[PDB]
C-alpha cells in the first residue's frame, strides 16, 4: 500500500564492481561487436594465438571420422576463416585489445606475499558492507 512497508533502505547502493580489468574487457567486447565478426572466439583477446588457423584456413577442430553436413551459414561459424573485412574491422580494435592484455599481464604478475597483513579482513576494503 502507500506506506505498508513503513520504510525503504535507499541508502543501500548498487554493489560496485571491483574486478581488475572489467572496463578493458567490456571495451574490447564492444569493439569486437562493432566489428560484426560472426566468430565468437574473437571475444578472447588472445584469439590469434589460441586459434592460429582462424586467419588462414579456419579449421579449428579435427573432423576425422565425424560427418560434416552444414545446412546454412550458422552451422559451423567457427570453421570459417576471417575474411579481409573481418581482419580490417578487428585491426580497428587493436588498442583496446592491447590494453586488455596489458591489464591481464599486470594482474598475473601481481602475486600474494607475506608482506600483506590485511588479507584476512579484505572485505571492508572491497566494500562488501552496506
Amino acid at each position: 500500500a502507500l506506506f505498508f512497508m513503513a520504510n525503504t533502505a535507499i541508502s543501500v547502493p548498487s554493489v560496485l564492481d571491483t574486478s581488475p580489468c572489467m572496463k578493458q574487457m567490456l571495451a574490447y567486447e564492444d569493439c569486437v561487436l562493432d566489428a560484426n565478426v560472426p566468430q565468437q572466439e574473437v571475444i578472447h583477446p588472445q584469439w590469434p594465438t589460441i586459434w592460429p588457423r582462424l586467419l588462414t584456413d579456419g579449421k579449428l577442430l579435427e573432423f576425422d571420422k565425424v560427418p560434416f553436413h552444414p545446412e546454412n551459414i550458422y552451422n559451423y561459424t567457427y570453421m570459417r576463416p576471417l575474411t579481409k573485412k573481418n581482419k580490417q574491422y578487428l585491426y580497428e580494435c587493436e588498442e583496446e585489445r592491447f590494453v586488455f592484455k596489458a591489464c591481464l599481464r599486470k594482474v598475473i604478475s601481481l602475486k600474494k606475499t607475506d608482506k600483506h597483513t590485511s588479507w584476512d579482513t579484505a572485505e571492508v576494503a572491497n566494500l562488501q558492507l552496506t
Partner: peptide, 15 residues
C-alpha cells in the same frame, strides 16, 4: 601445436 601454428596432421589441443 601452437608453436608450429597448428601445422600438424591432427589437432589434439584442448583450449
Amino acid at each position: 601445436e601452437k608453436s608450429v601454428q597448428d601445422n600438424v596432421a591432427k589437432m589434439t589441443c584442448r583450449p
